[PDB]
Amino acid sequence: RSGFRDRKVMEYENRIRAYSTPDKIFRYFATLKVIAEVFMTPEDFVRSITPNEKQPEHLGLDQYIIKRFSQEREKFADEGSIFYTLGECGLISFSDYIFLTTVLSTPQRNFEIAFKMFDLNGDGEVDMEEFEQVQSIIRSQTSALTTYFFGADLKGKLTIKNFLEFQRKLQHDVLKLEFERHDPVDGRITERQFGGMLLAYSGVQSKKLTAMQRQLKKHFKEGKGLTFQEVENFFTFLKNINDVDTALSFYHMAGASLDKVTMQQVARTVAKVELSDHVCDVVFALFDCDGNGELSNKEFVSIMKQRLMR
Template sequence: MMFIIGEPASRRHFEIAFRMFDLNGDGDVDSEEFEKVANLIRQQTSIGNRHRDHANTGNTFKGVNSALTTYFFGPKNDEKLTIEKFLDFQQQLQREILTLEFIRKNPDENGNISEADFAELLLAYAGYPQKKKVKKIKRVKKRFRDHGSGISKEDYLNFFHFLNNINDVDTALTFYHIAGASIDQETLKHVARTVALVELSSHVIDVVFTIFDENMDGQLSNREFVAVMKNRLLRGLEKPKDTGFVKLMHSILKCAKDTKPVLLDL
């Protein structure tokens, strides 16, 4: 269950995920259906197997599952989970995780982080050699040293909403590439607006191009951009160096507590 709720994806994908839990096809999910599929997911994922065998993370896993079950199905496990409640919780969870990442960069008095901090967050799980990552971040620092306005939390959240639709964005950018059209800043803004239904600020797009436009010709290498952004969405959760799993558990528990008073005593 953790990887369906915690993994960034489009609303359409989460609707599909919900249907997967609805085993009898009545449009809602009960606690028994939820538990069956959740157990299956834990058995079939490497992280689920890894943490199931460790006492500390295993206890956290059980605690969060108990909190989620209470939130979704009530204290007696006799309520039904609707798709609206499922999607609302997922959106709150993702927003909270992204907000925590943003706050860790210590926003200034205006609530903004620097362009370099934004670049570091985007490249966190890029898989680049350290030297290449440092080079890109230095380029951003140099570009915005004298006229940087920073990145607001809303701009940050909007960009990750865009990334949640990265597979559809990939398809759109591929069509542009096949047609021989260049992927400039206006094109990326148009794709964000029409595919992800989000308005990216010109400044955010400028920073993104500074990161990925290696020869600074005003055009984006869509293959590298999409590959890096897909890695970023995973947050390294499927890698041995993973440090985010337990934090993700606590984020889910906190989200449940904040949105349902009955969970406050868990």
């Protein structure tokens, strides 16, 4: 089969994603050349950070699609998408690319502080140039919209409250696109796809997704599917693994069973979010010990941390 080609193709695509210069990555994943400069569609962007999704055949390295340069022009983004704030109509310039990749992987922690740095008294404000600095610094651990951030004149102040909102939102749209790049029939994704998602940033544990489908097959949960809401609530649960971690440990030490009920519980009390009953059966299929239903917390929290961190 031509499946030994995919294997070598992803290995390659992956190697780029994690060792090549920002530049090269871009010239690989981005599929649009506009007359003349290259841009990557939201889909491309996301596919550049997800490490296993293949690149469209004849597109690829230094091979893009030629597109001839009002409210009647092409639109790749969508209603609300933070990708419009990027000037174009949902297209991401190489420049926008760096910014965005570094606003995706850095913690609120860092920004909150780095901002407070330029507002010794206020809670955190930055002008057009101050911000340019907060990046050079933050980028050391990894005018499209400049006007969007500081009025049209560039004398506007950027607030940590607004930025966090900006990030907390970029993350939403990115997370949705990942749910989208799986073809959801009626808004639902497979119990297998959902796992593919939860394990993306991990080894070839892609084989334990079979250990899952069996577990579900047995208990008659073999095929409902996971809607985005369900997927998303899990991921807002995941932003707290730290608290969820130390919280799942106490339930352990207190001699309770780390089963579906206590996970749903640690979600309400530690992350103030209601988990779907199915998400838990699926987050268990592939995370309990072996059939146990005993959420192997150590192993869980681990994976989730790199998933949560891309």
